[PDB]
Design an enzyme around this catalytic site. Structure first.
Site, PDB file in Angstrom:
ATOM      1  N   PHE A 106       4.503   2.183   8.532  1.00 15.04           N
ATOM      2  CA  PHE A 106       4.564   3.001   7.313  1.00 15.04           C
ATOM      3  C   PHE A 106       5.722   3.976   7.453  1.00 15.04           C
ATOM      4  O   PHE A 106       6.122   4.328   8.560  1.00 15.04           O
ATOM      5  CB  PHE A 106       3.280   3.755   7.015  1.00 15.04           C
ATOM      6  CG  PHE A 106       2.709   4.645   8.099  1.00 15.04           C
ATOM      7  CD1 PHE A 106       2.004   4.077   9.163  1.00 15.04           C
ATOM      8  CD2 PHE A 106       2.861   6.017   8.071  1.00 15.04           C
ATOM      9  CE1 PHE A 106       1.486   4.896  10.154  1.00 15.04           C
ATOM     10  CE2 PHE A 106       2.344   6.858   9.056  1.00 15.04           C
ATOM     11  CZ  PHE A 106       1.638   6.274  10.095  1.00 15.04           C
TER      12      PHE A 106
ATOM     13  N   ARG B 166       0.828  -1.196   0.000  1.00  9.29           N
ATOM     14  CA  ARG B 166       0.000   0.000   0.000  1.00  9.29           C
ATOM     15  C   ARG B 166       0.869   1.255   0.000  1.00  9.29           C
ATOM     16  O   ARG B 166       1.600   1.524   0.952  1.00  9.29           O
ATOM     17  CB  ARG B 166      -0.959   0.011   1.195  1.00  9.29           C
ATOM     18  CG  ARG B 166      -1.880   1.217   1.256  1.00  9.29           C
ATOM     19  CD  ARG B 166      -2.814   1.074   2.457  1.00  9.29           C
ATOM     20  NE  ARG B 166      -3.681   2.227   2.632  1.00  9.29           N
ATOM     21  CZ  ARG B 166      -3.822   2.950   3.730  1.00  9.29           C
ATOM     22  NH1 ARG B 166      -3.150   2.682   4.840  1.00  9.29           N
ATOM     23  NH2 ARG B 166      -4.663   3.979   3.717  1.00  9.29           N
TER      24      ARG B 166
ATOM     25  N   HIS C 278      -1.117   6.794  16.020  1.00  6.64           N
ATOM     26  CA  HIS C 278      -0.165   5.791  15.558  1.00  6.64           C
ATOM     27  C   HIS C 278       1.121   6.024  16.324  1.00  6.64           C
ATOM     28  O   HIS C 278       1.538   7.159  16.579  1.00  6.64           O
ATOM     29  CB  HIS C 278       0.067   5.855  14.041  1.00  6.64           C
ATOM     30  CG  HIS C 278      -1.174   5.505  13.284  1.00  6.64           C
ATOM     31  ND1 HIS C 278      -1.427   4.260  12.776  1.00  6.64           N
ATOM     32  CD2 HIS C 278      -2.260   6.255  12.994  1.00  6.64           C
ATOM     33  CE1 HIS C 278      -2.604   4.252  12.184  1.00  6.64           C
ATOM     34  NE2 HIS C 278      -3.128   5.458  12.297  1.00  6.64           N
TER      35      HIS C 278
ATOM     36  N   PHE D   8       1.642  10.867   0.885  1.00  7.68           N
ATOM     37  CA  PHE D   8       1.147  10.356   2.166  1.00  7.68           C
ATOM     38  C   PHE D   8       2.231   9.458   2.766  1.00  7.68           C
ATOM     39  O   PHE D   8       2.959   9.934   3.635  1.00  7.68           O
ATOM     40  CB  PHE D   8      -0.165   9.612   2.014  1.00  7.68           C
ATOM     41  CG  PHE D   8      -0.915   9.282   3.293  1.00  7.68           C
ATOM     42  CD1 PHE D   8      -0.489   9.618   4.569  1.00  7.68           C
ATOM     43  CD2 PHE D   8      -2.121   8.600   3.183  1.00  7.68           C
ATOM     44  CE1 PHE D   8      -1.206   9.299   5.719  1.00  7.68           C
ATOM     45  CE2 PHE D   8      -2.860   8.273   4.317  1.00  7.68           C
ATOM     46  CZ  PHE D   8      -2.409   8.623   5.580  1.00  7.68           C
TER      47      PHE D   8
ATOM     48  N   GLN E 258       3.476   1.847   2.969  1.00  9.09           N
ATOM     49  CA  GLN E 258       3.216   0.904   4.060  1.00  9.09           C
ATOM     50  C   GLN E 258       3.523  -0.539   3.694  1.00  9.09           C
ATOM     51  O   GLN E 258       3.192  -1.015   2.603  1.00  9.09           O
ATOM     52  CB  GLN E 258       1.748   1.054   4.447  1.00  9.09           C
ATOM     53  CG  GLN E 258       1.224  -0.021   5.382  1.00  9.09           C
ATOM     54  CD  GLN E 258      -0.220   0.277   5.762  1.00  9.09           C
ATOM     55  OE1 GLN E 258      -0.712   1.392   5.565  1.00  9.09           O
ATOM     56  NE2 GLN E 258      -0.896  -0.716   6.313  1.00  9.09           N
TER      57      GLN E 258
END
Length: 172
Positions: free
Chosen positions: A120, A62, A133, A67, A70
């Site tokens: 990530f 992903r 997170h 952004f 991950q």
């Protein structure tokens, strides 16, 4: 404690693309940094899932432009799996460190206290993730290799090419 240094050697569509070197915050989040470190070395062997507790050979499944990238799902390879060295899921250790910019290393999760092996690498400042997170490290070399992977992401998260952790391990 101190700070471990770990690495990923990356391939993109099978081509060697360089090394990402990360510094972990063992002094701030010892339990979380320790999980990541051991998953880099593979030293806890086979996990409850029957698969190696090791990032080697897994992919960044992903990747979203502007952004983050991950990975860490070495059991299902799709976001639904992964396993910490502790045995499946563990709680958020603390939220001392914040998402300050590109290179930030943080744990993926599915709500409070659900850390596994998925993680990530941020390609932007993701301050909206602060307190949700757990941040446990940062990239200190190879940010260009992080950008190269990022260029293969899509808004949908699906990579255009296989972005693989072809080797990994601990340095210092």
């Amino acid at each position: 404690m101190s700070r471990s240094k770990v690495f990923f050697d990356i391939t993109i569509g099978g081509k060697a693309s360089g090394r990402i070197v990360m510094e972990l915050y063992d002094d701030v989040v010892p339990k979380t940094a320790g999980n990541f470190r051991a998953l880099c070395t593979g030293e806890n062997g086979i996990g409850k899932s029957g698969k190696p507790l090791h990032f080697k050979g897994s992919k960044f499944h992903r990747i979203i432009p502007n952004f983050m990238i991950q990975g860490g799902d070495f059991t299902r390879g799709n976001g639904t799996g992964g396993e910490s060295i502790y045995g499946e899921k563990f709680p958020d250790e603390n939220f001392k460190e914040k998402h300050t910019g590109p290179g930030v290393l943080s744990m993926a999760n599915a709500g409070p206290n659900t850390n596994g092996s998925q993680f990530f690498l941020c390609t932007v400042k993701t301050e909206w993730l602060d307190g949700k997170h757990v941040v446990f490290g940062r990239v200190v070399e190879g940010l260009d290799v992080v950008k190269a992977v990022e260029s293969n992401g899509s808004q949908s998260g699906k990579p255009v090419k296989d972005c693989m952790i072809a080797d990994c391990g601990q340095l210092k």
